[PDB]
Amino acid sequence: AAQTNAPWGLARISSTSPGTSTYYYDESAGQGSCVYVIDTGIEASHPEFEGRAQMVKTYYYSSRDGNGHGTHCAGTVGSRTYGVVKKTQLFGVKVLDDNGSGQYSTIIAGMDFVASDKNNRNCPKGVVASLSLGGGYSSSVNSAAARLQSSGVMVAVAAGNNNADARNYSPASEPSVCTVGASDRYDRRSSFSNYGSVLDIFGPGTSILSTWIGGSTRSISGTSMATPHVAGLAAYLMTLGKTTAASACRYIADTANKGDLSNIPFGTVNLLAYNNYQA
Ligand SMILES: [Ca+2]
Ligand SMILES: [Hg+2]
Ligand SMILES: [Hg+2]
Structure with a gap:
């Protein structure tokens, strides 16, 4: 399948060069997989979700x-127009308040919740969790992420937006999960993106158009925005049967576009998420 005049980020993940505008993908489109979006909640009634989204916990x-x-982040995972995996099921867990903030204790609770909840859902192709959030280092927050991953969920987390080494950030610095940096239209590392040896992969993060509240749309930038591109790609690859939850991050890095990105500091991976689609 081909989505013509797609958002740049979608085109970029199905291309081996920058500057294309069509998103190529397999029609399966992540059907049978599930993505938990742990965030400020999801406006599930937005038409772009086609009834495939629901709130499961606040x-x-x-x-x-x-x-x-x-x-916005759910939309990048699996909205019709703005989404990577256009037929996935989306579950919303609200750990952040309407100002975008939350205590670590409540973020940890939300992670433990997903590990348990996925047991009462029908997700034949596997389960992904997308965390476009993070703060200063905390071993407890890292540990909750590690538990969620070991429970059999593909965990993708934001690297952080401080233009700094992500080792000092939580969400990000847990090695066992998939830590995502951000890039821009021209294949540069986003100016705000954290970097460092703990990054696994980059995705599109600058000027990302997606769904917004009040049934609208909005372009926004941040390494937060890259996260859901990789979460969606995992769900898509898992439904294709290419990889499992446990090995998805590695599979994505293995099959990535390598060496395309500029302004990557020595010691940081130069790998850009790529769907490897062939008609
Ligand atoms: Ca990792
Ligand atoms: Hg977003
Ligand atoms: Hg978000």
Whole structure:
């Protein structure tokens, strides 16, 4: 299948060069897989989700996304127009408040929740979790991420947006999960993207168009935005039967576009997520 005039990030992940505009993908489109989006919530009624999204847990007074961030990131995972895996099922877990902030204790709870909840869902092709969030280093937050991964969920996390070594950030610095940096249209590392040896892979993160709250759309930048491109790609590859939850991050790095990115500091991987599609 081909989506013509797609968002640049979608085109980039199905191409071996920058500057294309068509997103090529297998029609299976991640059907039978599930992606938990752990964020500010999801506006599940947005038409772009086609009834494939639902809120399963909140840690605040409401389950509604009053922020937009979570809705945007879900959209990059699996909205019709803006999504990598256009037929995946999306589950929203609200660990962040409507200002975009949350305590580590509640972020940890949300992770432990997903590890258990996936046991009562029908997700034949596997289960992914997308965490476009993070803060300063915390061994407890790293440990919760590691548990979620070991439970059999493909965990993809943001590297952080400080233009710094991601070793000092939590979400990011846990080696066992998939830590994602951000790149821009021209194949440069995004100016804000964290880097370092703990990064596994880069995805598109600058000027990413997707769904927003109030049934709208919006372009936003941040290494947060790259995360869902890799989460969606994992779900897509898992439904194809190419890889499993446990080995997805490695499989993605193995099959990545290698050496394309500029402004990568020595000691950081130069690998850009790539679907390897062939008609
Ligand atoms: Ca890793
Ligand atoms: Hg987000
Ligand atoms: Hg986003």
